[PDB]
């Protein structure tokens, strides 16, 4: 928090805590299923899947293997997009709208084109 600030330190701790809870409970998700969870464990599993695909951006050198354009997100745009998805502002969007995209601007444009 002394090099990246107080805003960037809270977003990094919140994103890592959601991914660690879904990975430890994978033995009940792959055996019993996703219906064996409670009300609090169900919302954390859906947000962890969308946060893992949003961090994977398509590079400019891998345009021939993926087919999409290269996305270069800045440091200020990446911290604002991760904090809004963890607060409940992007819970109605699908999980495929954030895969292979940029920041918060590319996630809203991909969800509107897939629903048309």
């Amino acid at each position: 928090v002394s090099v990246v600030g107080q805003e960037h330190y809270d977003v990094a701790t919140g994103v890592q805590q959601t991914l660690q809870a879904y990975k430890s409970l994978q033995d009940i998700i792959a055996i019993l299923g996703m219906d064996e969870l409670s009300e609090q464990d169900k919302l954390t599993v859906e947000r962890a899947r969308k946060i893992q695909r949003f961090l994977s951006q398509p590079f400019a050198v891998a345009e021939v293997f993926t087919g999409i354009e290269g996305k270069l997100v800045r440091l200020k745009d990446t911290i604002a997009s991760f904090k809004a998805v963890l607060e409940g502002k992007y819970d109605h969007l699908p999980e495929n709208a954030f895969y292979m995209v940029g920041g918060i601007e590319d996630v809203v444009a991909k969800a509107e084109k897939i629903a048309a």
Binding site: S24, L25, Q26, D27, I28
Partner: protein, 43 residues
């Protein structure tokens, strides 16, 4: 292949932690009903 006598609690993973939490939650609820009934029968 065999020898699975108590292999759930001996692992200590997701199934091991859920078995200890389920037994501790059931014993805590039954102890409250047994302590309240014993105090009323002594007076």
């Amino acid at each position: 292949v065999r020898s699975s006598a108590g292999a759930v609690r001996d692992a200590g993973g997701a199934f091991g932690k859920r078995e200890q939490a389920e037994e501790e939650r059931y014993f805590r609820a039954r102890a409250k009903e047994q302590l309240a009934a014993l105090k009323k029968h002594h007076e």
